[PDB]
Amino acid sequence: TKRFYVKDHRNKAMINLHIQKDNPKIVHAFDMEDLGDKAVYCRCWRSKKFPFCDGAHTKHNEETGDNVGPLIIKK
Amino acid sequence: TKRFYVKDHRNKAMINLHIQKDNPKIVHAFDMEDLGDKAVYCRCWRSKKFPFCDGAHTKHNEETGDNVGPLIIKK
Lengths: 75, 75
Ligand SMILES: NS(=O)(=O)c1cc(C(=O)O)c(NCc2ccco2)cc1Cl
Ligand SMILES: NS(=O)(=O)c1cc(C(=O)O)c(NCc2ccco2)cc1Cl
Ligand code: FES
Ligand code: FES
What we know:
The structure is a homodimer.
Chain A: E1 26-31, E2 38-41, H1 56-64, E3 68-74
Antiparallel strand pairs in A: 2-3
The complex binds the ligand NS(=O)(=O)c1cc(C(=O)O)c(NCc2ccco2)cc1Cl (2 copies) and FE2/S2 (inorganic) cluster (2 copies).
Cytoplasmic side (chains A, B): 2-75
Family (chains A, B): Belongs to the CISD protein family.
Enzyme class (chains A, B): transferase
């Protein structure tokens, strides 16, 4: 049967679970001029160094089956 | 009682639900030189123009109670 399967539905789960929860919409804005050679930005909301990627996405992806990863601005 | 409350637990929900699901870890990398005056990057995995923000985060935040928003690289 399909009695164990949750049918297709509009998502209700949060993405960010703990970061800056007194801020109603977390936005970051950086000037290119202040960036060094490389900046690696977190898109999974699990990094301890958010907004910078710290490799936490690997645990997120393994535990949930997801496929997210960071955004890189270089040169 | 607390019979309606889901206790604190390690997350199991995905963040990305539909984007590039044949890619096992979605990473984007851009050279500053190719960026114009402003780039607004999606961190919610709902944008129709992912990896660029299209304001979909507003619906995500309203429907789930979350507080995520984009990453801006300017100048
Ligand atoms: N697309 S990938 O697997 O080769 C890749 C993957 C990753 C990754 O971290 O998975 C990455 N992050 C660099 C980093 C991590 C912490 C600080 O900088 C960069 C790249 Cl190019
Ligand atoms: N922190 S905020 O509420 O003032 C803000 C909020 C947003 C926002 O979209 O919520 C934003 N996005 C600009 C955009 C949207 C689509 C293309 O560029 C920029 C800013 Cl500075
Ligand atoms: S730690 Fe979040 S994308 Fe790498
Ligand atoms: S649409 Fe995803 S952060 Fe704006």
